[PDB]
Amino acid sequence: KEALLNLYRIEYRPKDTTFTVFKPTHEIQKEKLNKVRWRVFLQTGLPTFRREDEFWCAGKVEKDTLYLTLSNGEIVELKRVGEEEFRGFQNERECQELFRDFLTKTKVKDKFISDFYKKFRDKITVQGKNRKIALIPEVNEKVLKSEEGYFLLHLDLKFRIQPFETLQTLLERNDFNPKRIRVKPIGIDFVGRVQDVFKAKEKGEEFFRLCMERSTHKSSKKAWEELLKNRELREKAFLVVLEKGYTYPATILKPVLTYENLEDEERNEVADIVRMEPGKRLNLIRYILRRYVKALRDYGWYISPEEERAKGKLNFKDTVLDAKGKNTKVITNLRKFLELCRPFVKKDVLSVEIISVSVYKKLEWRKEEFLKELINFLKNKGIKLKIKGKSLILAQTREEAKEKLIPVINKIKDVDLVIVFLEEYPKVDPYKSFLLYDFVKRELLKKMIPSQVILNRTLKNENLKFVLLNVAEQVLAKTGNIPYKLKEIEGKVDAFVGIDISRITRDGKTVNAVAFTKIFNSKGELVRYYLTSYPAFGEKLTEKAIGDVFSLLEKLGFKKGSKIVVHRDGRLYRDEVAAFKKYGELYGYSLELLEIIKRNNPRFFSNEKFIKGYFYKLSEDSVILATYNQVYEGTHQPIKVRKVYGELPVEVLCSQILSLTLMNYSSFQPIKLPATVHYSDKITKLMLRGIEPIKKEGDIMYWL
RNA sequence: AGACAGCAUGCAUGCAUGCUGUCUUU
């Protein structure tokens, strides 16, 4: 059952172990810490890692002092402490830091990309109704620390999708308003949403000088160079403000596109290179890693050519039973379970509003048939669906659909569920990004209305019964009549609590923020949810927000001395952790608190189709965990789970997580997140965008 | 002395070729 991850043990043991250490003349503002380290490595030319407040250069310096200039014009002075000897890294950060810099100095990554081009240049550029599209290979490296304490190189491969089109071009060619595009600057390893666009006619001369003077890359230097010399360009050229507070000229900014927001035709050519199956991927990873070894071993770097291995499989309680007690263990679906299944009917008249979007007027028959058989099925379950209104919307593009959905959805009030049939809408404007299914989902989630959006492509492709159940199972859950429950979960847990918090910014000060909290009993059924907006608190926000969660648990009569598990989609920072102990005492609860980091984790490469439950154990109580099986084409990315604190083993916390997976009530699609935090961040970001104070709650998975 | 052609050197345009560098893909 062997499963391998793209992680490779790494250590650094050079012959010359002599570094030159540098210290700040006064404490450095923490988020300025990385910019400074980067800067040391440019001047020095010597790889550098940061050791608490000090800087370590892998060579011999003489320079008594060393002055570095940040983009502000701000100057940090480093003094030479003197040479120190190197024995080990204290943590992975040091190790990563130095490791990448070596990659830079040696230029391996650069070579591989070049090489990769010489050979696939042609297979990597593709054609489309109107546009051309480059798929550019991205090699990426982090350093992690395993359970036994070895460091591990995390190595991956991806294909960033891009047009052949400068951002300037698109802003003269159009006069367009795209404050919602992601972007990469040529020769800069950065990618981030376009914040603010102004023109270059509004800035002096000394300006583009300093701008040049402080550029930390060749291409940005050469960019501002242009505007510094050629005044012809100035009046024409545009200037773009970036996500994490950068400005670049518009000629070095090219868009970064996502698979999804590809117009249909394109998606298809793309698909093979972008979605490449495990084997190939792993082989390239292997292939790069070799170059890396070959090019770095001579400077003292020791890298196993061998992949770490899945430590094993966790069993978790996947047994599930209906209102009669009929039960079966969840692996994939049991389409059979769902047929003979008999739900916990809480509300037995349901009022649907129906919407259908479509090109022409009399072709509703597939939809009408599908609806007929749902209504039926649901009746044979104790539920009668009753239809309050239908709306047939004719439309010819996504936009026309959109414009027309807006008032229709607007008038909708007092209903258990809305069902929406969406016709297929072929392309759009490629800048005018927009998934139509989502839009609907979004507009209805804002209304707290549980909804079912059925793609008319799905009814043309999939079998009526297959579809029937997937829908039938969500709708049942959606609307309070839970179709089956978990028998139990590992541990003697009393509530599982999922927290989620989004915060709008202004001058580094947190202004609006929206918290979504979801509470579940021991057997794992929703007890109530909590949708709360907060006005501005600063420092004090984090405390209030948690505080509420506790004052809440208590109003639900969680008898003190009860046990409370807290999953979170984000990444808990220090103040939260302590904030949690505080309230853990005051309310007298024993708490397990987890951090779930879903994005960009190492991958399992394995022969087994059913990798749910696999894992690899990292240092400090954190685990890489498969939560779903490899359904092919799309990427299986495991979740990283991390016991911040608690009396229970992480393996036990992980199985709970796997149990709760099943409570998203989606036997067929493979929901990656567990039911406490699933879609939590979608809702949180979504209500933020909102335009007035919110404080709602309820007892029904309206969001599924 | 004029008018025309072969060759040489120096220059003018046109078109084409070999190598090297950059960036495209720090």
Next chain:
RNA sequence: AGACAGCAUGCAUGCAUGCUGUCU
């Protein structure tokens, strides 16, 4: 492989100048 810059060349047409030969 393409875009641009460095360098080295080739063919072609003419002009400059120079010796060459024809010419009414």
